[PDB]
Amino acid sequence: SERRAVYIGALFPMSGGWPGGQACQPAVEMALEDVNSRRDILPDYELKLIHHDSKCDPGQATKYLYELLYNDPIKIILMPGCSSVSTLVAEAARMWNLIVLSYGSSSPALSNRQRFPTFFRTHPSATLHNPTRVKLFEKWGWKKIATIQQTTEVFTSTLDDLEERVKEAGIEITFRQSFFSDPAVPVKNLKRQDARIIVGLFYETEARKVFCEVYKERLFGKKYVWFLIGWYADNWFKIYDPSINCTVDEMTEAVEGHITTEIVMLNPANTRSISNMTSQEFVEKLTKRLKRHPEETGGFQEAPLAYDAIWALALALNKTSRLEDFNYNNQTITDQIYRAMNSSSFEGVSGHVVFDASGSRMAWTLIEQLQGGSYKKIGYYDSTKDDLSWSKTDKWIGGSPPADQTLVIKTFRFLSQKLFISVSVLSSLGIVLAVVCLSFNIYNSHVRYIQNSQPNLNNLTAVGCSLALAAVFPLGLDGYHIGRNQFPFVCQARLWLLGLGFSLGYGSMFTKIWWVHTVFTKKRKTLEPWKLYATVGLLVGMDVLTLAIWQIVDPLHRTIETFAKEEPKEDIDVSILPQLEHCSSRKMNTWLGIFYGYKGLLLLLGIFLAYETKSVSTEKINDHRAVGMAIYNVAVLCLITAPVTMILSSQQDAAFAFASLAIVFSSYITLVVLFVPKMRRLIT
Amino acid sequence: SPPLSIMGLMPLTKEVAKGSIGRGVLPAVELAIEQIRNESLLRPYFLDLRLYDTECDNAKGLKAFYDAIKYGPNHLMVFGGVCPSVTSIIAESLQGWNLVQLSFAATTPVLADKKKYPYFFRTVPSDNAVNPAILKLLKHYQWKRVGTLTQDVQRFSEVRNDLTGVLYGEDIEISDTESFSNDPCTSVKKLKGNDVRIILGQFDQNMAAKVFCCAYEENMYGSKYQWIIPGWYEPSWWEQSRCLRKNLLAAMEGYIGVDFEPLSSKQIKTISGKTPQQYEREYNNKRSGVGPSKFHGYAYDGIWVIAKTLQRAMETLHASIQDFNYTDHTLGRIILNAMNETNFFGVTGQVVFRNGERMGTIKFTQFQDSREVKVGEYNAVADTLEIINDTIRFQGSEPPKDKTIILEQLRKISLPLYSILSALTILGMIMASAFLFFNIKNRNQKLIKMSSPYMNNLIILGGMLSYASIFLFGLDGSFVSEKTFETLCTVRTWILTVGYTTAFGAMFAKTWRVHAIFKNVKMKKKIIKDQKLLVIVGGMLLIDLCILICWQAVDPLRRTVEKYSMEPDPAGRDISIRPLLEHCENTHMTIWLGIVYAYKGLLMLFGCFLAWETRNVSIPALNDSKYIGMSVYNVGIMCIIGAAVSFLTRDQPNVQFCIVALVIIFCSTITLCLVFVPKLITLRT
Numbered sequence A: 001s002e003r004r005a006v007y008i009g010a011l012f013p014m015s016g017g018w019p020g021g022q023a024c025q026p027a028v029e030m031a032l033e034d035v036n037s038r039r040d041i042l043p044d045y046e047l048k049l050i051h052h053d054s055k056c057d058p059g060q061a062t063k064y065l066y067e068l069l070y071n072d073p074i075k076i077i078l079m080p081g082c083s084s085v086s087t088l089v090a091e092a093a094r095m096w097n098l099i100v101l102s103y104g105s106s107s108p109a110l111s112n113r114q115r116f117p118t119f120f121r122t123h124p125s126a127t128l129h130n131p132t133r134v135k136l137f138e139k140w141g142w143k144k145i146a147t148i149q150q151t152t153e154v155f156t157s158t159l160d161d162l163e164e165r166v167k168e169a170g171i172e173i174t175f176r177q178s179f180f181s182d183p184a185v186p187v188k189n190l191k192r193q194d195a196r197i198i199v200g201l202f203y204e205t206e207a208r209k210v211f212c213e214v215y216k217e218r219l220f221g222k223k224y225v226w227f228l229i230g231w232y233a234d235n236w237f238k239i240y241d242p243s244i245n246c247t248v249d250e251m252t253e254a255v256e257g258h259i260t261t262e263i264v265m266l267n268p269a270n271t272r273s274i275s276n277m278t279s280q281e282f283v284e285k286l287t288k289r290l291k292r293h294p295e296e297t298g299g300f301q302e303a304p305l306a307y308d309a310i311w312a313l314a315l316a317l318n319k320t321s322r323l324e325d326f327n328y329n330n331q332t333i334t335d336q337i338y339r340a341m342n343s344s345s346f347e348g349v350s351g352h353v354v355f356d357a358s359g360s361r362m363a364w365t366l367i368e369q370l371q372g373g374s375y376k377k378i379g380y381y382d383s384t385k386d387d388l389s390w391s392k393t394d395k396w397i398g399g400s401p402p403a404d405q406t407l408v409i410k411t412f413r414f415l416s417q418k419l420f421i422s423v424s425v426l427s428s429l430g431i432v433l434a435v436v437c438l439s440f441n442i443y444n445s446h447v448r449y450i451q452n453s454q455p456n457l458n459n460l461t462a463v464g465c466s467l468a469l470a471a472v473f474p475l476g477l478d479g480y481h482i483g484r485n486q487f488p489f490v491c492q493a494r495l496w497l498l499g500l501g502f503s504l505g506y507g508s509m510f511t512k513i514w515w516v517h518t519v520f521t522k523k524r525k526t527l528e529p530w531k532l533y534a535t536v537g538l539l540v541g542m543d544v545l546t547l548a549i550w551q552i553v554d555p556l557h558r559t560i561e562t563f564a565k566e567e568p569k570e571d572i573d574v575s576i577l578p579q580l581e582h583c584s585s586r587k588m589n590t591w592l593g594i595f596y597g598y599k600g601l602l603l604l605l606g607i608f609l610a611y612e613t614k615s616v617s618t619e620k621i622n623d624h625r626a627v628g629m630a631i632y633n634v635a636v637l638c639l640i641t642a643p644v645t646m647i648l649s650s651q652q653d654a655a656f657a658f659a660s661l662a663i664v665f666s667s668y669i670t671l672v673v674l675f676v677p678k679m680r681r682l683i684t
Numbered sequence B: 001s002p003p004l005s006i007m008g009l010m011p012l013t014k015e016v017a018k019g020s021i022g023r024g025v026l027p028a029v030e031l032a033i034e035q036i037r038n039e040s041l042l043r044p045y046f047l048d049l050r051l052y053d054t055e056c057d058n059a060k061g062l063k064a065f066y067d068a069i070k071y072g073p074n075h076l077m078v079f080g081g082v083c084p085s086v087t088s089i090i091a092e093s094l095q096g097w098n099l100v101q102l103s104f105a106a107t108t109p110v111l112a113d114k115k116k117y118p119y120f121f122r123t124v125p126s127d128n129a130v131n132p133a134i135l136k137l138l139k140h141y142q143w144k145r146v147g148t149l150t151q152d153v154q155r156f157s158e159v160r161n162d163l164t165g166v167l168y169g170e171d172i173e174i175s176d177t178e179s180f181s182n183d184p185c186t187s188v189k190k191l192k193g194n195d196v197r198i199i200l201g202q203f204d205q206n207m208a209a210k211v212f213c214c215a216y217e218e219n220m221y222g223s224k225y226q227w228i229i230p231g232w233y234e235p236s237w238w239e240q241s242r243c244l245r246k247n248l249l250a251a252m253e254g255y256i257g258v259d260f261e262p263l264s265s266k267q268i269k270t271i272s273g274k275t276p277q278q279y280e281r282e283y284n285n286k287r288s289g290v291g292p293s294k295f296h297g298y299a300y301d302g303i304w305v306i307a308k309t310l311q312r313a314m315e316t317l318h319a320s321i322q323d324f325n326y327t328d329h330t331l332g333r334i335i336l337n338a339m340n341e342t343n344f345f346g347v348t349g350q351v352v353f354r355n356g357e358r359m360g361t362i363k364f365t366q367f368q369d370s371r372e373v374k375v376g377e378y379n380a381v382a383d384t385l386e387i388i389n390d391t392i393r394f395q396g397s398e399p400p401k402d403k404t405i406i407l408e409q410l411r412k413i414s415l416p417l418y419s420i421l422s423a424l425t426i427l428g429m430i431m432a433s434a435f436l437f438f439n440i441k442n443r444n445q446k447l448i449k450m451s452s453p454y455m456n457n458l459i460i461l462g463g464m465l466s467y468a469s470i471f472l473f474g475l476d477g478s479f480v481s482e483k484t485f486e487t488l489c490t491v492r493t494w495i496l497t498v499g500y501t502t503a504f505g506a507m508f509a510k511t512w513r514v515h516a517i518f519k520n521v522k523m524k525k526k527i528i529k530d531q532k533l534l535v536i537v538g539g540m541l542l543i544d545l546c547i548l549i550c551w552q553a554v555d556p557l558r559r560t561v562e563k564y565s566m567e568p569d570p571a572g573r574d575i576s577i578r579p580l581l582e583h584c585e586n587t588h589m590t591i592w593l594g595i596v597y598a599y600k601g602l603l604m605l606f607g608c609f610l611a612w613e614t615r616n617v618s619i620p621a622l623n624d625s626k627y628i629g630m631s632v633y634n635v636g637i638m639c640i641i642g643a644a645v646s647f648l649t650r651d652q653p654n655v656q657f658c659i660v661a662l663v664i665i666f667c668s669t670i671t672l673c674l675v676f677v678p679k680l681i682t683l684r685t
């Protein structure tokens, strides 16, 4: 014989909140008969099982724990079924120096080694849905992920680990909400926070309610990816529930296209383990021994974990191979069994069975997707090797994975084209005509029709209007010439040049009619030849002090206006924000209003004096009618075009068009009227 | 005598701090057991107690529990347990052997369920026994809105969850439900942003000094807020950082601590026959070597509780110790029946049992700048909240209770300033209607030394209409005895504009005709041309009448109110003040008032420029216009300075009104004064 009966305590919840004991008990009976049937596993000993029901109730469980612990004989390894009973026995196992092995405890708090140093579990915990989730996020580079959970310990203990795991991947979790049984307000908050990818952690009976609510708010569709758990039945969105008013195919349309992360329960291949069996003979033996139906019993999916749960400890005790005399006081046998169980690594019915440093066993997660009314596999994963296998059956909205919301900045285009070029060629014709007429006037300065006294102020007006026709062009467009992004430099240069040019030209224009009104109301001095011209030139040069004061305290700014609404585009989810630019300052509006008022003051003074001295005669007699008509044109032009360039910003056919038409029509028409009677009657 | 065995599960060591609790509660229970040995109380048994050290580690406690079960005699009940986990697991497991657990330090509300724990009882008041107390305290001084502040631990969040369940049904508001973990400073930020009157704190001891230290920085204290804090900390708790007692001490007044009371409040005879004072003297002289715990009252009480329970079960035993293993449950059911209806008076008061709990005495207290003095009690058995008046204090006179209560009023003007201007109202008007009679004296005694017969009459008409408008300007604004007079703002602004254009038209058309006869070359002396000048003034008059109906059409210009909000307090009361100013405009008539002021400026600067010209034109055909330019300059500067100061004001509605009255009584009589002050002086030589 020599059959030393080594006894091992166990526990199987036959009913209650987790009826796993209906399925695990024939499984552990098969596994104990299998290790009995091999002498390689049993050199000298023989494993025996003593067990009691607990219904996942700690009150009965503590009583049964005492009943097995303080009776005879001495047990070594314990086996708790449910989760809370496993926590209770692993908390208190340290005072007897025992090692405990669970097979269903998905408690993520059971990974602690301080409170639980001597505990392992073949069933993986719930935190191994998170590395596959973060790898599925790393495949597509999504950065704004929102989470919603039922207010439960088994989900709040998962999502914080998901946070402190995803923070190393550089993906932020923005909206982290929670509810208990009211699904309306959290999906209201999610619609108001309009997130893209949504992760959920909840059971089936509230899953139906939250999917009725998300059908009602219309938050499914194109840019929405739903991550859920996968241990629901394949029919779960089909059983009639009167708790929600949503219809069945309206629910089916709502649940369409979401990714599920299950976990494996058996060998995906058809190989043979050290147990020398496959999946099919195992399922046949379970249907033989189980008097119930596998479709109606509980714990049938976790039932293959019991087989290698027995087999791992059996191989560990065979590796220890001074064993039949264990007592709870000593520690060396316990440390030897713990060291043998630490290095457990082989191939069993659930695939490769390796424990981590904490005590959990890693496994594979069959990542799937609901694709049109039925579940279908996407692929597999293993955490220890990053071998993200694939099968390419994931349908999408158009084939591509929809991602987080982005934005395109579109710069508001000008019309630097032939419309700009007609303006530029009219400016060039004005420039050539003005400088040619000014050179012709300077090269007539011996003796002429109008004598040498008067039109040197007219020459200075020609210089000023030439500077206006030289400052009309560099107001720019939406970045069109060699070298850009110096827009404050070119705007301040153009503005300073146009200010000095218009100031010079209009001052030397207006001073002649001021002095002919002065000589009309003097009842012929011209006291010094540059007296009147120099004092009106200093009146002009007062304005460059205003320009310098504008340059000292707030010279320049390149602002950005965002006048239009984002996303007017029709098919792509990239929001188009049209932004424009006009060169500005810190507070320029009241400043430009004050400057317009000052120039309007001088211009209305000129337009009143022009009606004043409309009929006179002096030494410079052949100038006043044409000078007055030019004043009458330039005043109404500048006053009719100051507000439409002050208050406008749409430069396409209105702002720059009206401003350029004003300035070039002003200089063009005033010169082509002011030089008709001179050169035509000089050689007429 | 045959013993009745009982088991105590107490920390007896010197390592764990709960060993101090066990060493403090052992003298009271040995005093109770020796008094029970003195009296008969039994027939003819005697009680025995076996102590078992736990240290309230779960594994060690369950191992000692198993050792006591396996090795001790046939126990009947089980007693003790202080740490909540090692009480909770045994109270869950209790239904196996069908025993009863009596605790005196289980202070967790998770033991409230009887579906979880049907065989468990405790005499210590739980943390849920402060929530009706705080309800009665809030209803004693009529509070509605309160703000909570809970540390994110399971016990504090559980009492926060039951806070809503106890306040469901009454006039209570919960605004700021902030629940921080380790940053209380943003919680004080959010609470001051929601400016809630009452703080309902829920945290441990070490967080409290940090809470007060970074609540001093926001100054969330004073005679405006109260602080309801669980005050079961150690005495002189504030000694445990980087802050200072100056920024700690000035926020701990109005600080209300809600604890459970150790003893009774009387010198009354208990079930022992003695008084609480004599019991307390015997307790503190029983051992004289231990710092006294705050649980020995309930420890002394529970012995009499279980003794009365077994005394109430002995007659049902006689209806049958000698017939009870750990397996029987019917005897334990009779034990539950005799235990549940326990009702007598002990050291803590009249003990009851409403589903495993007795209504205790809640001791309110206040830190009165040196210590937390006891201020009030409450018994949930009778639901009456006693208070000790003439002992509580407040930094304010009245106990603050200060919701943010607001008040508003109109902006008033200074009446000794307004009254002298109302006295200057009449003189310009009477001088106007008298100088009009001097002009009719020129009509009645004909010698036409001036212009057209209607011109100075138009000047006097403009002056009278301006002096009526500036009088009825602020009498309708500030003095609100005529309330619907901001509608009459539109009924007086047309009067003011007509007076302005009449006066400046009589200033302007005359000077324009002087310009039109100065720039001629041959001759100009016509009376029909002066008729043309008067109808030319009438043309811009009817143009301004069209502008008047355009002002009626562009906006109603109804009564609007600017609500200027700064909220100070002049005498310490929390009823804040925010003033409001009447505004006649409709805030989109800026284009309208801009074009009206531009109309007036373009019509006004004509004469201001022309005064530079006609300063030497001494035309005797009109016999005037030598000082009229000196008038028009000295009114053209003042009208624009009045408009400039008017638009640069209404920040204070007093200075703007007195300065526009000052410039109006400047201009509207300085025109008449500088048009007549050499006139009658030379006509009365």
Ligand SMILES: *[C@@H]1O[C@H](CO[C@@H]2O[C@@H](C)[C@@H](O)[C@@H](O)[C@@H]2O)[C@@H](O[C@@H]2O[C@H](CO)[C@@H](O)[C@H](O)[C@H]2NC(C)=O)[C@H](O)[C@H]1NC(C)=O
Residues within 6 Å of the ligand: A276, A277
């Ligand atoms: C593991 O069990 C198999 C069971 O194989 C089945 O039963 C056998 C009787 C045979 O008919 C197989 O074809 C069946 O599939 C054992 O299988 C065979 O054993 C023989 C022994 O001589 C060997 O020659 C075959 O190659 C085996 N075939 C296979 C597929 O394994 C096998 O021996 C068992 N292994 C151990 C280590 O026990």
Ligand SMILES: *[C@@H]1O[C@H](CO)[C@@H](O[C@@H]2O[C@H](CO)[C@@H](O)[C@H](O)[C@H]2NC(C)=O)[C@H](O)[C@H]1NC(C)=O
Residues within 6 Å of the ligand: A040, A041, A043, A315, A318, A319, A321
């Ligand atoms: C179970 O334990 C026994 C020893 O108690 C192992 O038996 C020996 O294992 C070594 C391993 O290197 C082999 O080389 C020997 O041939 C084995 N001898 C015998 C008599 O079996 C046995 O391998 C263990 N079983 C396992 C690991 O499955």
Ligand SMILES: *[C@@H]1O[C@H](CO)[C@@H](O[C@@H]2O[C@H](CO)[C@@H](O)[C@H](O)[C@H]2NC(C)=O)[C@H](O)[C@H]1NC(C)=O
Residues within 6 Å of the ligand: A342, A343, A355, A356, A357
């Ligand atoms: C197995 O037991 C060892 C006990 O030593 C655990 O600790 C490791 O010990 C080795 C040396 O013995 C060190 O090199 C490692 O660095 C230790 N691990 C860590 C995480 O520091 C070990 O974790 C246990 N588990 C496994 C899977 O080896």
Ligand SMILES: *[C@@H]1O[C@H](CO)[C@@H](O[C@@H]2O[C@H](CO)[C@@H](O)[C@H](O)[C@H]2NC(C)=O)[C@H](O)[C@H]1NC(C)=O
Residues within 6 Å of the ligand: B337, B338, B340, B341, B353, B354, B355
């Ligand atoms: C168990 O406790 C409850 C709660 O006190 C008891 O109910 C009270 O019973 C008394 C009579 O014994 C009545 O006067 C009270 O009105 C009851 N309370 C209420 C709220 O109605 C109950 O009787 C106890 N049961 C036993 C067997 O003692």
Ligand SMILES: *[C@@H]1O[C@H](CO)[C@@H](O)[C@H](O)[C@H]1NC(C)=O
Residues within 6 Å of the ligand: A242, A243, A244, A245
């Ligand atoms: C939604 O469903 C509820 C039952 O859960 C039902 O009472 C209610 O009338 C439904 N709402 C409708 C039909 O608008």
Ligand SMILES: *[C@@H]1O[C@H](CO)[C@@H](O)[C@H](O)[C@H]1NC(C)=O
Residues within 6 Å of the ligand: B389, B390
């Ligand atoms: C204080 O309260 C007691 C309670 O009865 C009352 O008798 C007493 O008059 C009160 N004293 C004052 C000053 O309010």
